[PDB]
C-alpha cells in the first residue's frame, strides 16, 4: 500500500484499527552532487520537479540563444562598415576583439 | 480585548498562542481539542426485519362451497379450491368424491425477533458540530463542551469565548441512512409504500410497535397436493436477509477524512477537515503590567538537536539574564516552528531548554520569549523512521525544504542567465552608439 | 403513464383536469386541497420565566466575627456587615454596642409558577410541507395526508401519485422563535449564557426541570437598617415581565400570505404562496375504450348568463344528441374560464347546464365535452358587490378585460399610423422613380 502524509488505516479481522502516517525521509542527499539532489526532490516532490526543470531549461535556452543572437548582430554591425570599404583595412583592436581576419 | 484567531480541526494536538497588548505583559492562551462530534438532524421513517408468512387453517366443507371473506391483513391472499379429497390421520375426511372445497388463506406478519433484530431507515440533513475543548487562558483552565456555531459562548472568569462555525459544510452522512446493529450505511432505501419484493424494505413498519405494516412480498397461493391438508404458497425471499448478504461495508470503514461513526446518537468523530475560528472577549483585568513579570536582557539562542521529524524533534537552548525568577510565555510567531510548552519558568542567570517541531531543513525563526525576540538558527537532519503512528505536529510551509545547495543552483542557473542577457543588451547598445558615432563623420 | 401537472397552493378551491389519451376515453381527475401545513425543524435551547430572589436568614454572632461560605447558588451574593445592633420582638438580641456581625445571603431561583407560565426559546430551520388532499381519479375517491417532498407516494387502486416539492422555500418563521401561551414570535433572543438583566432571558434554564439555571439579574446586597433583622437587596426587575409588556404582536397577526400560526407542534397553515407540482403514474387498465362511453354528435354551446365576478357567475347551455346516456367529463383546456363541476350526466337528447367562471368581458373559450369540442362565445357583465368574502376562482390573464371597443380604438390608433407611413414610403419611392425617368 501507499501511505502518504495525510494518513492510512487498516483493520485485520478482529484487531483494532491501526493508523499510520508517512514522514518525509526521501532517498538521496539534498546537500551536494547535483544528480543526487534531483533524485531527492523527485522522490520528494514529483510533480513540481519536472515543471521546475522544464522552466529553468527553457529560460536558460532562451537566454543563451538570445545572447548569442545579440552578440552576432553586434559583431555584424561592427564589422560591416569596415568590410564595405574596397581596401578593407580593419584596425587591430577590433581584429582582436571581434575576431576578424 | 477582542482577540480573534484560528484553530485547525484536529483532535489530540494542543494549540498554543499568546496575546500581546502593546504595553503590558503577554497573556498565553492554550486550547487542546479532545473530541469533536458531528450530529445530524436525524428523522426516522420506518424499520424493517424478516417477515413471517402466517397461514390460517384450511376451511374444508364436504359437498358444499365456501367463500372468500377478507380480513385486510398485509398482503392477504385468499383462494378457494374445488375438487379436493383430503386425508387426516384417522382416514379420509369427506365421503363426497367431488364438490368438496378447501380455502387457503395466507398473510404476511413480521417476525418474532423484530424487536432486537431490525434496521432503522432514517433521513439526515443539516448537521451540528460540537467539541470538547480544554481551554487555558492565563493559567485558568476549564474543560467544557463548547458548541461551534457562531454563538453560544463559554464563560469562565469573565472571559467570553465564541468558537465560530466550521469552514466546511461537509458531512459523511448522506440524505438517507440505514442503521443496523450499531453500524450505519449510506443506502438509498425506498420510501414508505414503495417497498419492492425481494429487496430492502419489502416489510415497512412505521415504528417498532406501529401495528400497521406495509408488505409487498410477492405472495401467491398454490393448489394443494391431492390428498393433503396444507396451505402451499410461493413468495420472494426475505429482502432484509438479501440486504444482509450483500451489505457494502459500513461507514465506519469507508468514511473520508478518517471519521469514527458511532451509534446511539448517530454522530461522526474526529473528522480532520475544516478549521474552527475563535473569538476571545477578554476583560481588561487579566492584562498584567510589564514590571510584574520577568524581562530578559542579553539573551542568546542555540540549537542542540534538530531533526525535522513529525513530533518535537528539535531542541533550542536559550542562555538568558533577567532580574526576576518567574515564568513567562514562549511563542513562535510564524508557523516555522511549533513549540511544545507554552511557558518557561526562569531563574535569574540559568538556561532554558525548549522543544520545537519543524519541517525545515535550514530553520531560521525568531523566538519570542518573555517580551523579547531572539533568533534561533540551525540545520535540521532527516529522521530515522519512514512511517510513524501519530499525526504531524507542524505545518508544511511552501518552500520549506529547499536546501541551500539547491538555492545556489537556482540562483546561478536562473539569475546568471539574466546577467548574460543584460551584458548582451549593454554590448548591443554600446555597438549601436559606436556605429552612430562612426557615421557622424560624413 | 406519466401525467405531469401543477396545482396552485391554496386550500379549499377544487382543481379539475382530465387525461386525454389519444384513442381511449378521457379520464377525469379532481384534487381539492383541504389543509396545507408547513412545519419547521424546531430545536429547544432554553426556557425562561419570572424569577424569585431567594434569601437566607441572617446569621448573627454576638461580639464575634463571621465569614462567607459559598453555596454556589445562581447569582449568589454574600456580603457580611459589621457594627450591628439587631432586634427581636423580645427586646435586643445581642448585648454589645459594636462588634456584632450579620451575614446576608441572597440568590436567584426560578419561580414556583414556572411549569404553567414560561416562554420556550426555539430555533427553526428547514421546513417540511405536508398537505391533506382529497383525490378523485376516475370515480375512485380517497382522502389521505400527503407529504409534498418529491417522493413518498400515495397509493390507491394502482395509481401512484407523488406531490412534488414547493416552488418556493418561504417560511413565515425566522431563525429564532419564542413560544408563549399558544402564540409564536420571531424574536432574536440572547444565547444561553448571554442573558442580560432587565431583558428577556435573564433567567435561562435549559429545560423546564433542568435543575441548573443561568441567572444574570444584577443582584446587589445592601446594608440593613439599624435595629432590624432583614436582608435588603437591590436588583434589576424581571425581564420576562418587561418582555410581556413590550410584546409586538404574534405571528398569527403579522405573517404575510394569509398564514395561520398554530402550535400543537409549531406550524403554519394555509399560506397562499407557491404551487404544488403533481406526478401521476396511471396504469394501463383504467383506460376504457371510447365505444363503451357516450359520444356526442351535433353539440352546440350558448351562454345564458355571463358575469365576470369572482365566483361561478356564468351559465352555458349545451344542446347535444347523444349516442348513449351516461356521465362523461367536461373540461376547459385553457385558464380562460374555470368550470364548476368535473362531470355531467347525460340523457340522449337533452340539454346540459354547466357553471363556469371567467374574468373575460368577451369570453371565447372552447369547451371539451365527452370527446368533441364546442366553442362557447358571448359577453359578460359587471357584478354588483364591490367586496366579497371568498377568494378568486379563476385566473388573471393578461389582456383579459379589453372590451372590444377598446380593441377598435387601439387598432385604429396603432394601425392607421402604420398605413400612413407605408403609403408615405411608397410615395417617396414612386417620386424617386419619376425623377429618374424625367432625367432622361
Amino acid at each position: 500500500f501507499t501511505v502518504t502524509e495525510k494518513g492510512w488505516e487498516f483493520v485485520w479481522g478482529n484487531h483494532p484499527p491501526k493508523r499510520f502516517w508517512a514522514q518525509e525521509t526521501a532517498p538521496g542527499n539534498p546537500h551536494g552532487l547535483p544528480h543526487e539532489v534531483i533524485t531527492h526532490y523527485y522522490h520528494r516532490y514529483p510533480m513540481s520537479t519536472i515543471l521546475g526543470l522544464s522552466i529553468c531549461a527553457a529560460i536558460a535556452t532562451v537566454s543563451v540563444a538570445a545572447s548569442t543572437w545579440l552578440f552576432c548582430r553586434s559583431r555584424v554591425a561592427c564589422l560591416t562598415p569596415y568590410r564595405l570599404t574596397p581596401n578593407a583595412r580593419i584596425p587591430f583592436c577590433l581584429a582582436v576583439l571581434c575576431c576578424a581576419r | 480585548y477582542e482577540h480573534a484567531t484560528t484553530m485547525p480541526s484536529q483532535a489530540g494536538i494542543s494549540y498554543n498562542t499568546i496575546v500581546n497588548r502593546a504595553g503590558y505583559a503577554p497573556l498565553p492562551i492554550s486550547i487542546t481539542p479532545t473530541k469533536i462530534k458531528l450530529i445530524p438532524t436525524v428523522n426516522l421513517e420506518y424499520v424493517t426485519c424478516h417477515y413471517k408468512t402466517g397461514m390460517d387453517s384450511p376451511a374444508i366443507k364436504c359437498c358444499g362451497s365456501q367463500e372468500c371473506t377478507p380480513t385486510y391483513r398485509p398482503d392477504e391472499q385468499c383462494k378457494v379450491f374445488t375438487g379436493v379429497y383430503p386425508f387426516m390421520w384417522g382416514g379420509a375426511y369427506c365421503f363426497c368424491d367431488t364438490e368438496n372445497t378447501q380455502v387457503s388463506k395466507a398473510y404476511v406478519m413480521k417476525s418474532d425477533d423484530c424487536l432486537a433484530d431490525h434496521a432503522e431507515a432514517y433521513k439526515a440533513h443539516t448537521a451540528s458540530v460540537q467539541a470538547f475543548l480544554n481551554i487555558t487562558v492565563g493559567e485558568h483552565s476549564i474543560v467544557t463542551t463548547v458548541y461551534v456555531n457562531g454563538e453560544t459562548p463559554v464563560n469562565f472568569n469573565g472571559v467570553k469565548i465564541t468558537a465560530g462555525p466550521l469552514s466546511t459544510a461537509w458531512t459523511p452522512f448522506d440524505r438517507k441512512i440505514v442503521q443496523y446493529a450499531g453500524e450505519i450505511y449510506n443506502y438509498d432505501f425506498p420510501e414508505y409504500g414503495a417497498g419492492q419484493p425481494g429487496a430492502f424494505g419489502d416489510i415497512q413498519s412505521r415504528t417498532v410497535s406501529s401495528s400497521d405494516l406495509y408488505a409487498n412480498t410477492n405472495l401467491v397461493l398454490q393448489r394443494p397436493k391431492a390428498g393433503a391438508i396444507h396451505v402451499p404458497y410461493t413468495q420472494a425471499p426475505s429482502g432484509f436477509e438479501q440486504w444482509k448478504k450483500d451489505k457494502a461495508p459500513s461507514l465506519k470503514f469507508t468514511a473520508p477524512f478518517g471519521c469514527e461513526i458511532y451509534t446511539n446518537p448517530i454522530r461522526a468523530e474526529n473528522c480532520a477537515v475544516g478549521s474552527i475560528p475563535l473569538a476571545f472577549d477578554i476583560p481588561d483585568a487579566l492584562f498584567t503590567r510589564v514590571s510584574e513579570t520577568p524581562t530578559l536582557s542579553a539573551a542568546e539562542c542555540t540549537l542542540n538537536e534538530c531533526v525535522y521529524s513529525s513530533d518535537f524533534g528539535g531542541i533550542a537552548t536559550v542562555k538568558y539574564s533577567a532580574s526576576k525568577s518567574g515564568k513567562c510565555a514562549v511563542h513562535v510567531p510564524s508557523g516555522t516552528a511549533t513549540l511544545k510548552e507554552a511557558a518557561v519558568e526562569l531563574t535569574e542567570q540559568g538556561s532554558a531548554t525548549i522543544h520545537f517541531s519543524t519541517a525545515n531543513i535550514h530553520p531560521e525563526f525568531r523566538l519570542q520569549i518573555c517580551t523579547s525576540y531572539v533568533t534561533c538558527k540551525g540545520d535540521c537532519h532527516p529522521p530515522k523512521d519512514h512511517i510513524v503512528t501519530h499525526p504531524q505536529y507542524h505545518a508544511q510551509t511552501f518552500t520549506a525544504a529547499v536546501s541551500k545547495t539547491a538555492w545556489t543552483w537556482l540562483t546561478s542557473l536562473l539569475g546568471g542567465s539574466a546577467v548574460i542577457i543584460i551584458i548582451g543588451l549593454v554590448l548591443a547598445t554600446i555597438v549601436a552608439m559606436y556605429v552612430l558615432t562612426n557615421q557622424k563623420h560624413n
Side-chain angles (χ1 to χ4, degrees), chain B residues 246-294:
Chain B
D246 293 333
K247 260 173 64 174
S250 300
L251 201 60
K252 187 169 88 272
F253 304 111
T254 63
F257 297 95
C259 298
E260 299 172 359
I261 309 301
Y262 285 107
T263 173
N264 283 316
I266 292 171
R267 67 192 188 273
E269 300 290 333
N270 298 316
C271 303
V273 62
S275 183
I276 289 99
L278 289 161
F280 293 92
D281 194 359
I282 302 168
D284 298 332
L286 274 73
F287 289 102
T288 308
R289 297 177 65 88
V290 172
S291 63
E292 292 183 352
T293 57

Side-chain angles (χ1 to χ4, degrees), chain A residues 15-32:
Chain A
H15 287 283
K18 295 291 186 292
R19 289 187 177 184
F20 292 110
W21 299 90
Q23 66 183 2
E24 299 296 323
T25 67
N29 191 2
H31 293 288

Side-chain angles (χ1 to χ4, degrees), chain B residues 72-232:
Chain B
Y72 293 157
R73 285 173 177 169
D75 201 359
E76 191 267 331
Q77 295 289 322
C78 182
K79 191 174 181 180
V80 47
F81 298 105
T82 181
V84 172
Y85 194 77
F87 285 164
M88 287 288 289
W89 57 266
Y93 192 79
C94 295
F95 56 90
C96 301
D97 288 329
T98 61
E99 295 180 354
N100 297 324
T101 295
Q102 174 177 354
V103 164
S104 296
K105 183 185 287 184
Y107 61 94
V108 176
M109 59 185 177
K110 58 187 181 181
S111 180
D112 298 334
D113 305 332
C114 177
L115 192 276
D117 196 1
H118 67 278
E120 296 172 351
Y122 291 113
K123 282 187 174 180
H125 61 278
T126 311
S128 299
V129 190
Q130 173 180 358
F132 292 174
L133 261 61
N134 189 356
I135 307 165
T136 297
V137 177
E139 61 180 0
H140 289 84
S141 297
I142 61 165
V143 176
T144 307
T145 301
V146 69
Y147 297 165
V148 285
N149 52 9
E151 54 260 11
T152 309
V154 288
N155 294 315
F156 74 108
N157 293 114
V159 180
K160 182 176 179 178
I161 299 172
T162 297
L166 266 298
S167 66
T168 311
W170 176 78
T171 60
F173 300 102
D174 280 332
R175 194 265 305 276
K176 291 182 179 178
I177 285 172
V178 181
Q179 178 184 1
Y180 177 68
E183 296 183 356
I184 289 167
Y185 307 95
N186 283 320
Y187 188 68
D188 189 2
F189 58 90
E191 293 292 330
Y192 191 84
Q196 290 297 318
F200 181 72
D202 54 349
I203 299 301
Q204 283 173 348
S205 179
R206 174 65 70 186
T207 54
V208 187
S209 64
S210 177
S211 296
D212 193 0
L213 65 94
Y214 173 75
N216 191 0
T217 65
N218 200 359
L219 185 58
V220 174
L221 293 174
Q222 293 295 321
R223 190 177 188 272
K225 188 177 178 180
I229 300 171
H230 58 85
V231 176

Side-chain angles (χ1 to χ4, degrees), chain B residues 364-381:
Chain B
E364 184 179 1
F365 56 91
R366 189 179 69 185
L367 179 68
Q368 176 181 357
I369 194 166
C370 308
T371 56
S372 65
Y373 293 95
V374 296
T375 298
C376 299
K377 187 190 288 185
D379 287 329
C380 278
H381 305 92

